């Protein structure tokens, strides 16, 4: 039951909807971020939620109260889950994860970003984040597919928590990560294609999910 | 002169404008966060900026490309500055401060959150974040007012960077961020005068 999740990082809401409809046979969930949400309005999440379950990747990273409100707004706009940064601490994790459950939704905690800068501070506390997120009652984790040894460590520490991994798609990091991941997140490889439906179909076969 | 900054922490856009009109003349800048911007639309920053300059407290915390897109949208909607997390790495700091240059904007890097959770991971790397933000060419920092010794260390590491904090902190801070305390009173003019006196060192 592994997933292909589309990071629908286009900034035009109508284009976003067009792409979402095109890939419905091959993609399991859609993840949105702030450039789309700020450009199209938070209501774009309600529209997209009528096509696929929507993960609000808002990288929530504030004190508990503000973080709570952001999560609540996401769920009021039909998100099925939100993404929070574990680095900001257990109080925010507990609060956001409880709010999500009050809406019947899920939270994924970021262990470390897939960018080089993620190595500077996040890598060193990634495994501690896993335990804080587990203890805070959170459902899942976001972890890189790029750092395979680290992904293995995270899976070991996570036990059965759901893990989603950003991956370029049609690249070895993504293929290897499949064993440890519950879902692979792909962005521009699909949404910037001349034929997003065909690209999504190809990637499922390449990832063997 | 040290600054007084209004944290406009409501979710209704018309209420936010009503508050800004009443309190405007008494503060230097207005800070908005995502609950307001998501509820009212990012256009609320444009309308507020016509009253006082707006800091977009978006706690920007993504990979460099996406972070830059977020910063760009904030500046496109008239924000004078944005707040970014340094914890996510120097590459994001650089790219966001790179974007700010295009708009003549400022970037404030978060050293550590003022909540208890900030002590779990952020406190350990706070001073290193200052160094990265400084080397990234960022204008300023956000730092807690409730951890005085740490604030002292942050000022030391910051050099002349602008530090904003949400009396003991005043000697280190270039500005203080205050919310409901200013206006929920019967009288923002009087509350502001007291705060200006606190800031007058």
UniProtKB/Swiss-Prot annotation, chain B:
Q: Which UniProt keywords apply?
A: Decarboxylase, Lyase, Pyrimidine biosynthesis
- Reaction catalysed by this enzyme: orotidine 5'-phosphate + H(+) = UMP + CO2
Q: Which cysteines are joined by disulfide bonds?
A: none
Listed InterPro entries: Aldolase_TIM, OMPdecase, OMPdecase_arc, OMPdeCOase_dom, RibuloseP-bd_barrel
Q: Does the keyword Iron-sulfur apply?
A: no
Residues at the catalytic site: 59
Where does this protein act, in terms of pathway? Pyrimidine metabolism; UMP biosynthesis via de novo pathway; UMP from orotate: step 2/2
Q: What does this protein do?
A: Catalyzes the decarboxylation of orotidine 5'-monophosphate (OMP) to uridine 5'-monophosphate (UMP).
Which protein family is named in the record?
Belongs to the OMP decarboxylase family. Type 1 subfamily.
Would you tell me the protein name for this molecule? Orotidine 5'-phosphate decarboxylase
Q: State the organism named in the record.
A: Archaeoglobus fulgidus (strain ATCC 49558 / DSM 4304 / JCM 9628 / NBRC 100126 / VC-16)
Q: What is the lineage of its organism?
A: Archaea, Methanobacteriati, Methanobacteriota, Archaeoglobi, Archaeoglobales
